[PDB]
Design a protein around this ligand. Structure first.
Ligand SMILES: O=C(O)c1cnn(-c2ccccc2)c1OCCCc1c[nH]c2ccccc12
Ligand SMILES: O=C(O)c1cnn(-c2ccccc2)c1OCCCc1c[nH]c2ccccc12
Ligand SMILES: O=C(O)c1cnn(-c2ccccc2)c1OCCCc1c[nH]c2ccccc12
Ligand SMILES: O=C(O)c1cnn(-c2ccccc2)c1OCCCc1c[nH]c2ccccc12
Ligand SMILES: O=C(O)c1cnn(-c2ccccc2)c1OCCCc1c[nH]c2ccccc12
Ligand SMILES: O=C(O)c1cnn(-c2ccccc2)c1OCCCc1c[nH]c2ccccc12
Lengths: 151, 151, 151, 151, 151, 151
């Protein structure tokens, strides 16, 4: 049995994140989205859940402390995340090698879909709160809350 | 059922490659090493086989044409390869997105072990043929053939 | 009066190139595509011409020697090209600074459209000639010739 | 009619910035320097104005909110900025593609002059306030204020 | 007579730092570790001293202000530091060229040992304080204090 | 006693190379320029010699095989080279770590002078042979031979 943990702050979750969730869900038996700010923990969870109803083998859970302890305790087998740029890679390479060193846990990376390469939660927030239309970059459950939260 | 294809020229296979094979073999049901020069096809195959006897769910096969056609025809589910540097990533990102575009096939990357980050088949060859000791960087089945081939 | 030269081998021209042509044509009075292999010079020209009929202020011309001499002789005012990655940038930065040094000619770069970030003429060719469908990445005038050329 | 907006914090403006202003002013009908800390808004403006008296088609203006809204409202046609490194490019590539997505506004980049590649406002400030001579990196109107401000 | 200054915050010093100290000590007559937070200045000094007893030509000293003023005042001849990634290089390249500009002081870089490429003081701290075993990445004098400090 | 070897093809030597020679010569007792095409070996040597008459502790020598064997045999203590970009660094990092692995020989890097960051022997040649004035980028002994060689 295999299991991928996808860790992050998801504040908020983007269509880029969901694309990675979908791609991890097709290769692993279970996916756990581990949520480690604009939105509360509770809202971040609902946003992820409402955006992933089409993924029966995925669940969302709050995480505390080292991602590797989360992986080992819950019997998962790998960490999975997306990479957009060579700069993403150098940063994530450090964390992955450190995680391999301390716990023997492997990290698998997948390349962003080209259409979401420029998306970050932080940029989407900064733009959305200034009137920019980032609706095509985020799941509708997130768009709802941004519209409300900003009215 | 899941399956990872690890494609490359493997001329020759290195301990870095084997590390990736091992890590793919722990997450996927089968691994196929697809061999796409210093050594003949036949020798490259034996070198890979002799270096992976400890991996029962791995097999070696010659590949022709697009890696994605190999993946789809044989019912495999993903391409897996290692990345050493941000420059590896930018090059492999192009191929991965192109492969996703033409065939819907996903590529999962894993970070090199730190001790092999500077290893390439080409550099190992150029150095070995000049008297440099690269034996700690390559499997013993490869070292044997380099010693012979160079006597 | 302003003029941008867009230099390259265009073997063949891609939808990524055309996107840059369009964006240069909106800021400059004239655009000259300077064509500096799979296709003949004559075919490369027709492919560019047939792909740019919607750009009245753009023309195609064969180029020989330094791009800066082409710019100065024909009274153009800048070189314009696209960038996909940080690695594109470092290479093109060298040429741009050298061109500024020898001739005082400035180069303006524009970021690729995200959907074409992984496109190169060379990769498109290698894939197309192996049966891969790259038709969505190239103008129809190019697709025609690839289909013919490969039948 | 064409117009380039050059946005930034300009705290303070450097000779690198001025070089880009000059190069934008030669290709566009108007340039607007949009000023979006060590110096007040008022001082930043004077410093830019006093450093650009030789550019009749350039004006300085305070900016609020999205740069793209500034461009569209004032009938400008492009954003123009400098790039020093591949790392500058990856960061600015994200903003440029986001700006293209939300507003259709294009960004043109120009490579730094080699002599200013290591210049940043932040590094110049940190060094100047410690006695280092950064006078050759900044316009005299800025040097005046640094000398005063630091006496 | 030659002298290398190795500047940094060393909070705490790592085995990666010590490797660089050793390599600088073999090429220069003297090495000065200049200490410019988790640990006090006093503790940082002891940790460096206790970790370098095997280097008779190395001494540790607190630094204030520009590293170049430290180098010139004490008659040293160069700054020496390690680089892990291309991103380290671009950042350190800026500081090195600025230091050359203001004071004529040269900086020599050495590549990290592969086994420490993923090590940073900040990552080691964050992990150690969460129960992760980073003991193989740090000198025993540092490990002692982390164990104490965290009991 | 210390000694730096500066290895390369020097076809031809540039002002960027000479800047590095000068900076190595100020920190090491001897510098050996090891010459490992447009110009003959004999001419490359004369060009380097004529360009370095102001460096009494520098000599030029032809090199064969591994640079590390050259260093060890002649009792030198380090390899020294310049770096222009993060991409230079990633490539040279591989060679440096391989050289450390096989022979224990360390490599020290120095950052290019900003004014020569875009200079390469290959680009200078391609441009010079097309009429471009690269004379300010190369030593006069090289300029002489390019003028002759191209008349
Ligand atoms: O960094 C962000 O805020 C942010 C928001 N969306 N995307 C994204 C954009 C395009 C594609 C995939 C995501 C981002 O890029 C960071 C990717 C790093 C990452 C960390 N944890 C993850 C878990 C799942 C997937 C990715 C990650
Ligand atoms: O490029 C090479 O010649 C070469 C030789 N060994 N290693 C290596 C060094 C360290 C770690 C993993 C490999 C290399 O790096 C390239 C990694 C790209 C790659 C392409 N196909 C693959 C299949 C399996 C694993 C990796 C790849
Ligand atoms: O390098 C290639 O073969 C190739 C084919 N298509 N694209 C592309 C992909 C996405 C976006 C814009 C182009 C490529 O990327 C290289 C971009 C460098 C460039 C040089 N000359 C140019 C003239 C106009 C536009 C770009 C360039
Ligand atoms: O980042 C800085 O503080 C800073 C100060 N000077 N220079 C500079 C150094 C060399 C060359 C051109 C500028 C900097 O580099 C950042 C370049 C990004 C940029 C953003 N907005 C701009 C508007 C006009 C021009 C550039 C920019
Ligand atoms: O950045 C850190 O916190 C940190 C902790 N250990 N290492 C390291 C990891 C591997 C190898 C050499 C160091 C780090 O990498 C930063 C290297 C930059 C550097 C600045 N000053 C220095 C003085 C001596 C040596 C290096 C530096
Ligand atoms: O690569 C080239 O052809 C080339 C020509 N000049 N410069 C240069 C440009 C700016 C600054 C220092 C050199 C080049 O950059 C490559 C630098 C790599 C290098 C290898 N061996 C060396 C020996 C001494 C110094 C450098 C090197």
């Amino acid at each position: 049995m295999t299991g991928a943990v996808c860790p992050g702050s998801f504040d908020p979750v983007t269509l880029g994140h969901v694309d990675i969730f979908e791609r991890a869900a097709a290769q692993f038996d279970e996916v756990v989205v581990a949520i480690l700010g604009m939105f509360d923990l509770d809202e971040r969870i609902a946003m992820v859940k409402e955006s992933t109803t089409h993924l029966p083998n995925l669940r969302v859970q709050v995480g505390h402390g080292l991602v590797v302890d989360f992986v080992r305790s819950c019997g998962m087998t790998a960490i999975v995340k997306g990479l957009r740029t060579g700069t993403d890679f150098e940063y994530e390479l450090q964390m992955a090698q450190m995680n391999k060193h301390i716990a023997g846990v492997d990290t698998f990376f997948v390349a962003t879909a080209p259409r979401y390469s420029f998306v970050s939660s932080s940029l989407a927030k900064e733009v959305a709160m200034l009137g920019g239309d980032v609706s095509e970059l985020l799941p509708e459950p997130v768009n709802r809350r941004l519209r409300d939260r900003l009215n």
